[PDB]
UniProtKB/Swiss-Prot annotation, chain B:
It is found in: Mitochondrion. Coiled coil: none annotated. The gene is RTC6. The keyword Ribosomal protein applies. GO terms for biological process: mitochondrial translation; ribosome biogenesis. GO terms for cellular component: mitochondrial inner membrane; mitochondrial large ribosomal subunit. The chain holds residues 56 to 93 of 93 of the full protein. The lineage of its organism: Eukaryota, Fungi, Dikarya, Ascomycota, Saccharomycotina. Belongs to the bacterial ribosomal protein bL36 family. It comes from the Eukaryota. Present with 500 molecules/cell in log phase SD medium. This is Large ribosomal subunit protein bL36m.
Curated annotation (Swiss-Prot), chain C:
Component of the mitochondrial ribosome (mitoribosome), a dedicated translation machinery responsible for the synthesis of mitochondrial genome-encoded proteins, including at least some of the essential transmembrane subunits of the mitochondrial respiratory chain. The mitoribosomes are attached to the mitochondrial inner membrane and translation products are cotranslationally integrated into the membrane. This is Large ribosomal subunit protein uL3m. One of its GO terms (cellular component) is mitochondrion. GO terms for biological process: mitochondrial translation.
Curated annotation (Swiss-Prot), chain D:
Component of the mitochondrial ribosome (mitoribosome), a dedicated translation machinery responsible for the synthesis of mitochondrial genome-encoded proteins, including at least some of the essential transmembrane subunits of the mitochondrial respiratory chain. The mitoribosomes are attached to the mitochondrial inner membrane and translation products are cotranslationally integrated into the membrane. Keywords: Mitochondrion, Ribonucleoprotein, Ribosomal protein, RNA-binding, rRNA-binding, Transit peptide. It comes from the Eukaryota. GO terms for molecular function: rRNA binding; structural constituent of ribosome. Pfam families: Ribosomal_L6 (PF00347). GO terms for cellular component: mitochondrial inner membrane; mitochondrial large ribosomal subunit; mitochondrion. Component of the mitochondrial large ribosomal subunit (mt-LSU). Mature yeast 74S mitochondrial ribosomes consist of a small (37S) and a large (54S) subunit. The 37S small subunit contains a 15S ribosomal RNA (15S mt-rRNA) and 34 different proteins. The 54S large subunit contains a 21S rRNA (21S mt-rRNA) and 46 different proteins. This is Large ribosomal subunit protein uL6m. GO terms for biological process: mitochondrial translation. Present with 5700 molecules/cell in log phase SD medium. Disulfide bonds: none annotated. Belongs to the universal ribosomal protein uL6 family.
UniProtKB/Swiss-Prot annotation, chain E:
Residues 1-3 form a propeptide. NCBIfam families: rplM_bact (TIGR01066). GO terms for biological process: mitochondrial translation; negative regulation of translation. Belongs to the universal ribosomal protein uL13 family. Keywords: Acetylation, Mitochondrion, Ribonucleoprotein, Ribosomal protein. This is Large ribosomal subunit protein uL13m. InterPro entries: Ribosomal_uL13, Ribosomal_uL13_bac-type, Ribosomal_uL13_CS, Ribosomal_uL13_sf. The keyword Signal does not apply. Its main location: mitochondrion. GO terms for cellular component: mitochondrial inner membrane; mitochondrial large ribosomal subunit; mitochondrion; ribosome. Component of the mitochondrial ribosome (mitoribosome), a dedicated translation machinery responsible for the synthesis of mitochondrial genome-encoded proteins, including at least some of the essential transmembrane subunits of the mitochondrial respiratory chain. The mitoribosomes are attached to the mitochondrial inner membrane and translation products are cotranslationally integrated into the membrane.
RNA sequence: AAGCUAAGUUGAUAAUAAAUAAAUAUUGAAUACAUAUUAAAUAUGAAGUUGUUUUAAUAAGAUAAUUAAUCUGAUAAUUUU
RNA sequence: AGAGUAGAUAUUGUAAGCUAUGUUUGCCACCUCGAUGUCGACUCAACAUUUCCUCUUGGUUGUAAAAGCUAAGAAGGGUU
RNA sequence: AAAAAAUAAAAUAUUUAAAAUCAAAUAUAUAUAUAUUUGUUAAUAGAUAAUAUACGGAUCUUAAUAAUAAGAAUUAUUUA
RNA sequence: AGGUAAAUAAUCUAAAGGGAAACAGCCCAGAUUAAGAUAUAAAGUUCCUAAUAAAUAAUAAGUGAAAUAAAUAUUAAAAU
């Protein structure tokens, strides 16, 4: 290994904060998507925008992917997530079966919340 | 002195000491049991 | 009446504390030093001749160091100069040769225009000789040991064989054009250059040389010479310092 | 803790005082610190001697039954607790020395192995198998005396100093195993090997 | 418009005292603080192209704070160029040789920007192990501060 | 003969001391004991270290003179240490 | 484990285990493949310390002594 | 021997875990029903080559007294 | 193995910019020409070097502070 890819094995505090923020943003996006759908469905039934926003009973999304994203068991929120799953991917060939998320290529775009139950 | 990584006390008369940032095992009975952690 | 001045509170209200003494101070260095307890005298190496011991019969080569107008010009002290030393002056010189400033200096110190001046550093204030006095060969005792400083014979631009005792290359068996050119310098590649202090041809001699623990064979105030056992660095008429041996008593 | 809690008995002749130092010094560890402020003294019949001690420690002198106690401001602080047991023990040792006096008998074992007072008590010459002469000067406070040539006695008010001196004396020739042979401080023993 | 006026006072080299006995900062933090002053970053008239930093007189430098076991561990290196001449001195040894002021100076040097003005900036730092120093008389002072200081002390300082 | 040489002559291995590595200790709690401290105190100990010693480089400092019927240098001449 | 009289750890240490190293035999073709310094000698060494001797020191029924054995510190000097 | 008692400072271990259990929280019916999520070790030694120490460098672990004033610049989890 | 044989994705190749000390391929991000006020990305905010202040733990070893070295020993810490 003569070429030096000087990437540290762990993240800085600032990196971790940025990661957390990014995670929070994707959750927010999902929430917005569900909310807009609900609003649209209220409008279709025949309420005003404000009335729809007020509504006690929020409509859950019917499409599959959205419904999965809504579930925390499948796609957890940043507040829900463990410290470890925010900053460590599962890597079967690593010692500890764990690897920094920053070592994943395009980790800033690519999402990866859920690790295996005991790894 | 047996200078080694592993430093276990052999007999009851052995006693462990922590000096100079090194674990020593001295012994009051058997002088062969003198060890030092690196 | 008083002049205008302002002073900072930070510098006024600063609690007074003396600085700790440092190794690279003069006074510490002086304390460390291995020095003789007595002054010396400047001499000229007049030549060399045999000394026969009349009891035993043993012959020893002795250098004849002449002592002429040797005089304590002034001396230096720890409080002013940082060390204790006696500025000795040797011989007599013309007006013509000596600088106006030097002549004035000699007049102030009340000595004749001098042929060679040199310091002789000592341990204590007790070792200092009163200034103006004349130092004669009887200063030293016969049989005592002395250190001897002088500038060696100039050898000119010398080769590595004469400088450093390099073996050189072979005389025969194919050797071409480098019989004496000691080879292999600055290793190769690993250093990438000639590492400092690589023994190379250069100028040799004409440098100072202390010779320690030389025995004073003979002293006589009549002929104005100190006999000294063995060799002394430099040519004839070269100036030679002489002080008690620090190593030998 | 268990040592420091033990109260010290004093006889009327001896006085255990305490007072602040002229210029207190601070011992600085990596994380923790320790400011030496107070200075305990144990004055008595045979002599007087002192212990420089931290600020957190302080005495508790009782008039009744001749007892005095020692306590620290925080026993749950580890360093303080460690100091407490030390200091109490030290002042007990001092008390013992001033009232009774500490002793250290050195018995020399070997053919021509013996001690001698050379400089009228001020230098213990020791001859223990060496061409060169061996020995060392007695410190201040220590008084040495030789009932026999082969049995020296060191005596002093400070338990630390006397026993250090004894150890130094021994160090010229500690007991060999093959023949029980050398310098034995107090009740010192050695398991003798089989000759063969 | 803002720049136009008499700029002589802005570019004036002031003299800044720091009694190390009083200052509670550790060595490195103190050195870093000094470095800024030496550069002239504290003053708004600063420009990278122009050296415009003040003098800093450090005093009672023997009482400088050093954390951990750096006083007996921390090694200062040196090398001429000839191999086998790496000179490694521990902090305490360096102090014994020169002083605590030398140590501070080294820190300050390392803090400073690596260019032609660095040496000048380093020179402006004036460090002293104890209290007494020649620059006593030239530290910045004000008339409003004079009431705090007792009467004869000022006179003694002036005499000195 | 000189010179230069080494086959020759002479000198020298640079003390003392400072802190130390390994190692050997004293008092001593935390931790009834015990433990040389990876607690506070207290000791020793190396062809190593710091020094010392020597050589060279520098030039803080010092004494001395200051417009020259003789100031300090330099060119020039005669040479050599 | 097994030697080592009697005892695994005085000294010995299998097979396996975990590392280090970056000296060698490889392996790779990534360098130029206008790098002989063509691999050995001589001249000259410099450097490391993973210490051969020399200095300090622990153990060594396997240190009585002397030889040693073994280990620690140690690269100052020296090593045909 | 030696206990204001346990509530907590005994030993002998196993252990190094939020699966389980427990606590905290989300989600559904909701006067607390289920399901999902989150919560369980530290330091030293081991340590190891060759031009030169090399966290990029300086340097960073804070201390009442006492400055307008310092107090990680390391690691773990977070805030603005 | 900077290996080799394909598969897949991206970049490079043919991509200037910011980050990763330096840096073909990694992390960001795509130069039409300016300009430089407003958001920022990746990455950072004691100094060098643009830019910060906090909480709460834990570390004392300079461990560490952008290139995480192991079986094992020791000392601790929780828990059962």
């Amino acid at each position: 290994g003569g070429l030096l890819w000087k990437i540290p094995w762990r993240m800085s505090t600032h990196q971790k904060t940025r990661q957390r923020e990014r995670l929070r943003n994707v959750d927010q996006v999902i929430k917005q998507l569900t909310l807009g759908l609900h609003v649209q469905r209220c409008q279709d039934k025949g309420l005003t925008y404000q009335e729809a926003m007020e509504s006690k009973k929020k409509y859950k999304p019917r499409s599959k992917s959205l419904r999965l994203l809504n579930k925390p068991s499948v796609f957890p929120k940043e507040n829900q997530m463990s410290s470890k799953d925010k900053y460590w991917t599962f890597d079967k060939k690593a010692v500890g079966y764990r690897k920094g998320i920053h070592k994943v290529p395009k980790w800033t775009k690519i999402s990866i919340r859920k690790a295996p139950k005991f790894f | 002195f047996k200078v080694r990584t592993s430093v276990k006390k052999f007999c009851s008369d052995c006693y462990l000491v922590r000096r100079k940032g090194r674990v020593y095992i001295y012994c009051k009975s058997n002088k062969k049991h003198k060890q030092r952690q690196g | 009446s008083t002049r205008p001045f302002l002073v900072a509170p930070s510098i006024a209200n600063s609690i007074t504390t003396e600085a700790p003494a440092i190794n690279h101070s003069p006074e510490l260095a002086n304390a460390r030093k291995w020095l003789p307890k007595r002054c010396g005298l400047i001499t000229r190496k007049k030549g060399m001749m045999p000394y026969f011991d009349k009891s035993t019969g043993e012959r020893s080569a002795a250098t004849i160091l002449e002592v002429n107008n040797v005089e304590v010009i002034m001396h230096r002290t720890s409080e002013v100069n940082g060390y204790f030393a006696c500025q000795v002056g040797y011989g007599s010189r013309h007006l013509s040769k000596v600088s106006r400033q030097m002549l004035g200096h000699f007049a102030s110190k009340v000595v004749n225009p001098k042929e060679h001046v040199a310091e002789f550093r000592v341990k204590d204030e007790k070792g200092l000789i009163p200034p103006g006095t004349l130092l004669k060969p009887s200063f030293f005792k016969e049989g005592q040991y002395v250190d001897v400083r002088s500038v060696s014979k100039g050898k000119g631009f010398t080769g590595v064989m004469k400088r450093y005792g390099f073996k050189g290359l072979r005389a025969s068996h194919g050797t071409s054009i480098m019989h004496r050119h000691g080879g292999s310098y600055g290793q190769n590649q690993d250093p990438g250059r000639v590492l400092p202090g690589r023994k190379m041809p250069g100028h040799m001699g004409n440098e100072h040389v202390t010779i320690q623990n030389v025995k004073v064979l003979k002293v006589d105030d009549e002929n104005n010479v100190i006999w000294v056992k063995g060799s002394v660095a430099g040519p004839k008429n070269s100036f030679v310092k002489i002080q008690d041996a620090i190593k030998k008593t | 803790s268990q040592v420091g809690s033990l109260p010290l008995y004093i006889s009327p002749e001896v006085q255990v005082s305490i007072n602040a130092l002229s210029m207190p010094r601070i011992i600085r560890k990596g994380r923790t610190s320790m400011n030496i402020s107070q200075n305990i003294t144990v004055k008595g019949p045979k002599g007087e001697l002192s212990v420089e001690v931290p600020d957190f420690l302080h005495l508790d002198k009782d008039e009744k039954h001749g007892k005095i106690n020692v306590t620290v401001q925080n026993s749950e602080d580890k360093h303080q607790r460690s100091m407490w047991g030390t200091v109490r023990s030290l002042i007990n040792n001092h008390i013992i020395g001033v009232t009774e006096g500490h002793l250290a008998v050195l018995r020399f074992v070997g053919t021509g192995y013996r001690a001698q007072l050379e400089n009228d008590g001020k230098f213990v010459n020791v001859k223990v198998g060496a061409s060169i002469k061996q020995g060392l000067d007695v410190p201040e406070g220590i008084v040495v005396k030789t009932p026999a040539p082969t049995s020296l006695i060191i005596e002093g008010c400070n338990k630390q100093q006397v026993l250090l001196f004894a150890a130094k004396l021994r160090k010229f020739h500690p007991p060999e195993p093959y023949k029980g042979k050398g310098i034995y401080v107090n009740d010192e023993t050695i398991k003798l090997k089989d000759k063969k | 418009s803002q720049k136009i006026g008499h700029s002589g006072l802005a570019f004036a080299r002031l003299w800044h005292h720091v009694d190390v006995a009083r200052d509670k900062r550790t060595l490195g933090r103190l050195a870093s603080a000094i470095a800024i002053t030496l550069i002239g970053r504290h003053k708004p008239v600063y420009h990278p192209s122009q050296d415009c930093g003040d003098y800093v007189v450090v005093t009672n430098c023997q009482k400088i704070r050093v954390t951990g076991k750096k006083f007996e561990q921390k090694t200062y290196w040196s090398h001429s160029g000839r191999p086998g001449q790496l000179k490694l001195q521990t902090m305490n040894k360096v102090v014994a040789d020169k002083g605590f002021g030398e140590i501070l100076k080294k820190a300050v040097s390392g803090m400073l920007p690596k260019n032609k003005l660095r040496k000048q900036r380093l020179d402006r730092l004036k460090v002293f192990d104890g209290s007494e120093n020649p620059y006593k008389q030239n530290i910045t002072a004000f008339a409003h501060e004079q009431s705090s200081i007792p009467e004869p002390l000022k006179e003694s300082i002036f005499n000195q």
